[PDB]
Paper text:
We have characterized a glycoside hydrolase 5 ([name]) domain of a bi-catalytic [name]-GH6 multi-domain enzyme from the unusual gill endosymbiont [name] of the wood-digesting shipworm Psiloteredo megotara. The enzyme is part of a large multi-domain cellulase comprised of a N-terminal [name] domain, followed by three CBM10 domains separated by serine-rich linker region and a C-terminal GH6 domain. The results showed that TwCel5 is an endo-β-1,4-glucanase with a catalytic properties that renders it a potentially attractive industrial biocatalyst for cellulose bioconversion. In summary, the observed activities, product distribution, and cleavage patterns strongly indicate that TwCel5 is a β-(1,4)-endo-glucanase with a mode of action resembling that of other known [name] enzymes.
To gain structural insights for TwCel5CAT, bond cleavage pattern and mode of action, we solved and determined the tertiary structure of the catalytic module. TwCel5CAT was crystallized in an apo form and a dataset diffracting to 1.0 Å resolution was collected. The crystal structure of the [name] catalytic domain was solved to 1.0 Å resolution and revealed a substrate binding cleft extension containing a putative + 3 subsite, which is uncommon in this enzyme family. Furthermore, substrate binding cleft of TwCel5CAT is similar to other clade 2 [name] enzymes, showing conserved aromatic and polar amino acids involved in substrate binding. In contrast to most other GH5s subfamily 2, TwCel5CAT has a tryptophan (Trp226) in the outer region of the reducing end subsites. 70PC53, the halotolerant Cel5R cloned from a soil metagenome and Cel5B from C. hutchinsonii, respectively. Furthermore, the side chains of the amino acids in the conserved active site and substrate binding cleft were modelled close to flawlessly.
Residue numbers in the entry: 25 to 321
Write the structure that this text describes.
């Protein structure tokens, strides 16, 4: 095994037994026709590894909207392209069921994650993210029962690899999850998402409570801009979050590898799929490249 195994002990996600924070980058919605398919390539993964010094990539598979996995198996193929490349490159890779409604498609999630666990669960690289961003729904009554069903299905095949579970309110309410944690399975962490224009110390305080209640967090998506993925790059608030992640050994992936005309995109419209120069990178992209490159200092 050429990368260390990911596990959880108390409020820390460990890599080969070590508490630390790793950094990387999320792909956009995989959905056919949404414009960002062209970045789901081995070339792009290699460039993130070499030039961003990324440790993690996140493959964000659309599920239930037009063009998503429920309608079009090509979404899975794009995920596989990135997973295979991450394994070959000795990067961690998150397989993200990129839904806001996963409780409505429990059987389909189970079947997908069983397939992924069969294909990939003996690789230490692979991490499962079973529910991107629940909405304003109950942790105990809606998310938790979905999550226990999917986790049990994964764990029957793949006993060890990390599973990360979304939390209420766009993966903000990690404190609610921490009040009724998933104790019946090992190596479970919980999702925290922030955007620097929208979520400030109040959300850090909720995350701090969650960790001090005993659960481990993984910041599988965050942006430099506003929560809608557009707006001004907010350096000072981004940097306050980065300091909080480094202090608390929380790993993270930035939104997003995309050339869509919105502030969160790493690259300008029509940029090449890899090899990005500073003119190819957006204001966010240039700043994120510096954060991820220097993360290991
Ligand atoms: K657990
Ligand atoms: Mg395994
Ligand atoms: Mg604001």
């Amino acid at each position: 095994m050429d990368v260390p195994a990911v596990s959880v002990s108390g409020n820390q996600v460990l890599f080969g037994g070590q508490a630390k924070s790793l950094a990387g980058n999320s792909f956009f919605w995989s959905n056919t026709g949404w414009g960002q398919e062209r970045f789901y390539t081995a070339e792009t993964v290699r460039w993130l590894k070499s030039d961003f010094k990324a440790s993690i990539v996140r493959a964000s598979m659309g599920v239930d909207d037009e063009g998503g996995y429920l309608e079009d198996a090509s979404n899975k193929t794009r995920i596989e392209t990135v997973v295979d490349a991450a394994i070959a490159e000795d990067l961690y890779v998150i397989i993200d069921w990129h839904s806001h409604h996963a409780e409505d498609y429990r059987a389909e999630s189970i079947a997908f994650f069983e397939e992924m666990a069969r294909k990939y669960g003996n690789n230490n690289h692979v991490i499962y993210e079973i529910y991107n961003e629940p909405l304003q729904i109950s942790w105990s009554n809606t998310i938790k029962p979905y999550a226990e069903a999917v986790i049990g299905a994964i764990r029957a095949i793949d006993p060890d690899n990390l599973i990360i579970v979304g939390t209420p309110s766009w993966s903000q309410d990690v404190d609610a999850a921490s009040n009724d944690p998933i104790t019946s399975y090992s190596n479970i962490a919980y999702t925290l998402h922030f955007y620097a224009g929208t979520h400030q110390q109040w959300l850090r305080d909720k995350a701090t409570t969650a960790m001090n209640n005993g659960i481990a967090l993984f910041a599988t998506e965050w942006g430099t801009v506003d929560a809608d993925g557009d707006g001004a790059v907010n350096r000072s608030e981004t940097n306050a979050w980065m300091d909080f992640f480094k202090q608390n050994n929380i790993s993270h992936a930035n939104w997003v590898i995309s050339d869509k005309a919105e502030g969160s995109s790493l690259v300008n419209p029509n940029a090449p799929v890899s090899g990005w120069s500073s003119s190819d990178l957006t204001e966010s992209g240039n700043f994120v490249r510096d954060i991820v490159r220097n993360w290991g200092a």
